[PDB]
Design an enzyme around this catalytic site. Structure first.
Site, PDB file in Angstrom:
ATOM      1  N   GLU B 355     -61.021 -73.894  27.292  1.00 51.99           N
ATOM      2  CA  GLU B 355     -61.709 -74.697  28.360  1.00 51.99           C
ATOM      3  C   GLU B 355     -60.994 -75.206  29.296  1.00 51.99           C
ATOM      4  O   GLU B 355     -61.106 -75.425  30.532  1.00 51.99           O
ATOM      5  CB  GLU B 355     -62.556 -75.744  27.479  1.00 51.99           C
ATOM      6  CG  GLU B 355     -63.753 -75.387  27.046  1.00 51.99           C
ATOM      7  CD  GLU B 355     -64.875 -74.648  28.118  1.00 51.99           C
ATOM      8  OE1 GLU B 355     -65.203 -75.349  28.811  1.00 51.99           O
ATOM      9  OE2 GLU B 355     -64.963 -73.238  28.210  1.00 51.99           O
ATOM     10  N   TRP B 457     -85.509 -46.354  23.958  1.00 53.43           N
ATOM     11  CA  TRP B 457     -84.647 -47.435  23.481  1.00 53.43           C
ATOM     12  C   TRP B 457     -84.197 -46.954  22.199  1.00 53.43           C
ATOM     13  O   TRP B 457     -83.008 -47.093  21.975  1.00 53.43           O
ATOM     14  CB  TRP B 457     -85.479 -48.644  23.374  1.00 53.43           C
ATOM     15  CG  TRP B 457     -84.802 -49.729  22.710  1.00 53.43           C
ATOM     16  CD1 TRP B 457     -85.097 -50.274  21.371  1.00 53.43           C
ATOM     17  CD2 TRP B 457     -83.601 -50.381  23.362  1.00 53.43           C
ATOM     18  NE1 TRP B 457     -84.070 -51.210  21.005  1.00 53.43           N
ATOM     19  CE2 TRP B 457     -83.348 -51.449  22.093  1.00 53.43           C
ATOM     20  CE3 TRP B 457     -83.107 -50.777  24.529  1.00 53.43           C
ATOM     21  CZ2 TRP B 457     -82.374 -52.180  22.199  1.00 53.43           C
ATOM     22  CZ3 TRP B 457     -82.153 -51.552  24.527  1.00 53.43           C
ATOM     23  CH2 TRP B 457     -81.666 -52.466  23.590  1.00 53.43           C
ATOM     24  N   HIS B 485     -80.986 -62.821  27.032  1.00 51.40           N
ATOM     25  CA  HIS B 485     -80.601 -62.353  28.358  1.00 51.40           C
ATOM     26  C   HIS B 485     -81.506 -61.676  28.940  1.00 51.40           C
ATOM     27  O   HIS B 485     -81.662 -61.424  30.112  1.00 51.40           O
ATOM     28  CB  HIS B 485     -79.305 -61.536  28.279  1.00 51.40           C
ATOM     29  CG  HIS B 485     -78.079 -62.441  27.684  1.00 51.40           C
ATOM     30  ND1 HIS B 485     -77.211 -63.126  28.441  1.00 51.40           N
ATOM     31  CD2 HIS B 485     -77.709 -62.773  26.274  1.00 51.40           C
ATOM     32  CE1 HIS B 485     -76.468 -63.863  27.630  1.00 51.40           C
ATOM     33  NE2 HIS B 485     -76.778 -63.623  26.297  1.00 51.40           N
TER      34      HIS B 485
END
Ligand SMILES: *[C@@H]1O[C@H](CO)[C@@H](O[C@@H]2O[C@H](CO)[C@@H](O)[C@H](O)[C@H]2NC(C)=O)[C@H](O)[C@H]1NC(C)=O
Ligand SMILES: *[C@@H]1O[C@H](CO)[C@@H](O[C@@H]2O[C@H](CO)[C@@H](O)[C@H](O)[C@H]2NC(C)=O)[C@H](O)[C@H]1NC(C)=O
Ligand SMILES: *[C@@H]1O[C@H](CO)[C@@H](O[C@@H]2O[C@H](CO)[C@@H](O)[C@H](O)[C@H]2NC(C)=O)[C@H](O)[C@H]1NC(C)=O
Ligand SMILES: *[C@@H]1O[C@H](CO)[C@@H](O[C@@H]2O[C@H](CO)[C@@H](O)[C@H](O)[C@H]2NC(C)=O)[C@H](O)[C@H]1NC(C)=O
Ligand SMILES: *[C@@H]1O[C@H](CO)[C@@H](O[C@@H]2O[C@H](CO)[C@@H](O)[C@H](O)[C@H]2NC(C)=O)[C@H](O)[C@H]1NC(C)=O
Ligand SMILES: *[C@@H]1O[C@H](CO)[C@@H](O)[C@H](O)[C@H]1NC(C)=O
Lengths: 98, 595
Positions: B355, B457, B485
């Protein structure tokens, strides 16, 4: 909350002459179209304001500046440093300045 | 004329920096102290930033875009002129936001109830993610896998079909061919004398780099399959695919929960410095002060000294409701804060280095204009954060920072334990990421009609990934939309390119620091020449094309997979000796139900 009382000019027709000052507040005209005193595209108010806030990184916090400028026209004299006088002796061949 | 656009942006660059500041300062006060008088404090201050930007966006189309010569003022103009939504009819624009809100609340509030007790019901995050990550029961992992897709994913199938039609209309009104071409516009580069990049060129560079990982992924797939047959006998074929519900999580995205079943030498402890931290009385502040000494060791600036008061490095002494999630904030005006709730562990010793890497990237490009203060593409920002974490987790760095017995012996058995734990997260996610964006790109352009979404798929799972479904799924399911997502409208190719940029950066910095051994033992501490190689990219922002940013570090104009393979050659040598009696590869004909 931001101190919006400290402004600066961000648009002008031509750079200043040294020590020249300009407090006018006319609507700037960027493009060729005349402005007629109203805002709009290419017609901008010329003053912006620092919004200073206490949680700003350094380089974003307000600095106060004083510029001393010594000038020497052609008078007879004026202000200067503050001389210093030592101790005066007595009864000894000495080199003095009064 | 072009000089009117320069005067347009400088009024923009001084109204935006203040309005973005207090719209992000109010989001800090909500995130670190939750009331509802702070949520209403950030929703009105958040909407004043969004209403201001659409007003300047509709002013930006007064200037044409091809009558501009300077590359920098053209780049700022194109990022602001972008219409995005609002190109649709105003009743189609509110239909699209209704779908995106409905798909997002199905994923977060969908429940699954037990058939032995219909009064107990699990959400996905508490309870269903714990079964998929911890259980060794075949019948309970098969229950949690199928019931999440049949009770939640079937609700998203009529909503995702209407989402594809409305997103293709918005992309074709912005002069793209589909919504997949709209997502690839991040990597586009137009006219900078030899550094250009097409939006269709990204498709070939992903598929060209992927066929060099397939030798390494096949030997990892064969080793995990041979170790899973001891954990689940009479369920796995020795020449077939892996069943989709035995991979460590709900979707098989990371294989990182398979480490306890696939550890090479379980009688050697993988090195863990957490007890040496609580034996020297390290506070909350030592973890960042040793992190700041790492970055000043390479030739990077100190923290800004507003960093130490304004930040909130732990959860407070109050029992204070404040979203506890590691993150790096860039509020503006040179004010950088880190928000995390750090515990004394080597885990949060490492994410402190991660970070802080977002902060040192942010402090470097803070001299660009406002609209160019991002990473050079969407993938660079996370990649610079993770090469700080790789260099700090090495035992060479830990024994010089005071945390390892100066009489420690690294054996060749522990380097295999460390490299295999890396490959279950790094290499195991690369065919999942490549297959998913390839499926979504073909759905948007129309190569897959809607009567063959779930047929194509699961054919791509068996062929590319090597994963077979346990129960057949017809065209009433939507198994891609059961991922976060896909149902929350996010691009997924940024996780593929970040993995490739991460080892290109690390291999280029270790040649400048004069390393001698393998790449996985490297540390860039005490250097200055490597940091100067890193700082010449960090200060660019978006002002240059990203292909021009890569040559400042690596020396190439494209992403390359050969530095990723050099990191894993001690594992690839050991893996080819463990698969002398095994079968490398898989068959797309076997199924766990087809007998
Ligand atoms: C969360 O922050 C808010 C505002 O920052 C605090 O609410 C009030 O803040 C003012 C300062 O302008 C104080 O004078 C009030 O006393 C605060 N209200 C109360 C009820 O104390 C709020 O206190 C903060 N949350 C906590 C838990 O302290
Ligand atoms: C337009 O491009 C020129 C160079 O292509 C930029 O010129 C530089 O401007 C900075 C400050 O604005 C100066 O310090 C440099 O010395 C200039 N470079 C040269 C070679 O003269 C200019 O900044 C660009 N326009 C904008 C608005 O950024
Ligand atoms: C943005 O969308 C508009 C339609 O709302 C496109 O058409 C523009 O329409 C406006 C009037 O509302 C005109 O001033 C523009 O000249 C039109 N476009 C231009 C500049 O040719 C517009 O094409 C879209 N802009 C983009 C980013 O393509
Ligand atoms: C770690 O290093 C040792 C030392 O070389 C390796 O042990 C050798 O293994 C080979 C192959 O089995 C034998 O032919 C040698 O005789 C061994 N050396 C000794 C001194 O007995 C060991 O295999 C290595 N381990 C790994 C995982 O690479
Ligand atoms: C890498 O940097 C560290 C940090 O400055 C150096 O550590 C010092 O090492 C000397 C002798 O090894 C000690 O006397 C100092 O106390 C250490 N400093 C600190 C702050 O702990 C280390 O020597 C450097 N490595 C090289 C090869 O120069
Ligand atoms: C960074 O801070 C330390 C003390 O915190 C100081 O000794 C050092 O000189 C600083 N770095 C630079 C480049 O000034």
């Amino acid at each position: 909350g931001g101190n919006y009382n400290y402004l600066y000019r961000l648009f002008r027709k031509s750079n200043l002459k040294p020590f020249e000052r300009d407090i006018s507040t006319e609507i700037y005209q960027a493009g060729s179209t005349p402005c007629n005193g109203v805002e709009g595209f290419n017609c901008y108010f010329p003053l912006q304001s620092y919004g200073f806030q206490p949680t700003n990184g350094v380089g974003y916090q307000p600095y106060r500046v004083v510029v001393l400028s010594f000038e020497l026209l052609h008078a007879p004299a004026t202000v200067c440093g503050p001389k210093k006088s030592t101790n005066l002796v007595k009864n000894k061949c000495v080199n003095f300045n009064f | 004329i072009e000089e009117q656009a320069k005067t347009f942006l400088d009024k923009f660059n001084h109204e935006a920096e203040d309005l973005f500041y207090q719209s992000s300062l109010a989001s800090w006060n909500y995130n670190t102290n939750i009331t509802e008088e702070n949520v209403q404090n950030m929703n009105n201050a958040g909407d004043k930033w969004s209403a201001f930007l659409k007003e300047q966006s509709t002013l930006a189309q007064m200037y044409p875009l091809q009558e501009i010569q300077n590359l920098t003022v053209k780049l700022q103009l194109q990022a602001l002129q972008q219409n995005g939504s609002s190109v649709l009819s105003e009743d189609k624009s509110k239909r699209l936001n209704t779908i995106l809100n409905t798909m997002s609340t199905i994923y977060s509030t969908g429940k699954v109830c037990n058939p032995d007790n219909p009064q107990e019901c699990l959400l996905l995050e508490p309870g269903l993610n714990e079964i998929m990550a911890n259980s060794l029961d075949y019948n309970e992992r098969l229950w949690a896998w199928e019931s999440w897709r049949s009770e939640v994913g079937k609700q998203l199938r009529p909503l995702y079909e209407e989402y594809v039609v409305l997103k293709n209309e918005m992309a074709r009104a912005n002069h793209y061919e589909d919504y997949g071409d709209y997502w690839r516009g991040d990597y586009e580069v137009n006219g900078v004398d030899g550094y250009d990049y097409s939006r269709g060129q990204l498709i070939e560079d992903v598929e060209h780099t992927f066929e060099e990982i397939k030798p390494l992924y096949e030997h990892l797939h064969a080793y995990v399959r041979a170790k899973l047959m001891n954990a689940y006998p009479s369920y796995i074929s020795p020449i077939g695919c892996l069943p989709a519900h035995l991979l460590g999580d709900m979707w098989g995205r990371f294989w990182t929960n398979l480490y306890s079943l696939t550890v090479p030498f379980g009688q050697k402890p993988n090195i863990d410095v957490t007890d040496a931290m609580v034996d020297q009385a390290w506070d909350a502040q030592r973890i960042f002060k040793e992190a700041e000494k790492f970055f000043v060791s390479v030739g990077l600036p100190n923290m800004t000294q507003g960093f130490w008061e304004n930040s909130m490095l732990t959860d407070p002494g109050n029992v204070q409701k404040a979203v506890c999630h590691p993150t790096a904030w860039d509020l503006g005006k040179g004010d950088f804060r880190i928000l995390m709730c750090t515990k004394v562990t080597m885990d949060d010793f490492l994410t402190a280095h991660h970070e802080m890497g977002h902060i040192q990237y942010d402090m470097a490009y803070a001299a660009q204009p406002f609209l160019l203060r991002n990473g050079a593409n969407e993938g660079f920002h996370e990649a610079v954060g993770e090469i700080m974490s790789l260099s700090a987790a090495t035992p060479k760095h830990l024994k010089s920072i005071g945390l390892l017995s100066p009489d420690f012996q690294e054996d060749n058995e522990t380097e295999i334990n460390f490299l295999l734990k890396q490959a279950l997260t790094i290499v195991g996610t690369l065919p999942f990421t490549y297959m998913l964006e390839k499926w979504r790109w073909m759905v948007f352009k129309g190569e897959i009609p809607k009567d063959q979404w779930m047929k194509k798929w699961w054919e791509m799972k068996r062929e590319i990934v090597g994963v077979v479904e346990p129960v057949p799924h017809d065209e009433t399911y939507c198994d891609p939309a059961s991922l976060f997502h896909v149902s929350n409208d996010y691009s997924f190719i940024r996780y593929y390119t970040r993995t490739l940029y991460q080892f290109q950066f690390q291999e280029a910095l270790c040649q400048a620091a004069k390393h001698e051994g393998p790449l996985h033992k490297c540390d860039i501490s005490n250097s200055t020449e490597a940091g100067q190689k890193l700082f010449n990219m960090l200060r660019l922002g978006k002002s240059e094309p990203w292909t021009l940013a890569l040559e400042n570090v690596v020396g190439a104009k494209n992403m390359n997979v050969r530095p990723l393979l050099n990191y894993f050659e001690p594992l690839f040598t050991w893996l080819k000796d463990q698969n002398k009696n095994s079968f490398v590869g898989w068959s797309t004909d076997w199924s766990p139900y087809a007998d």
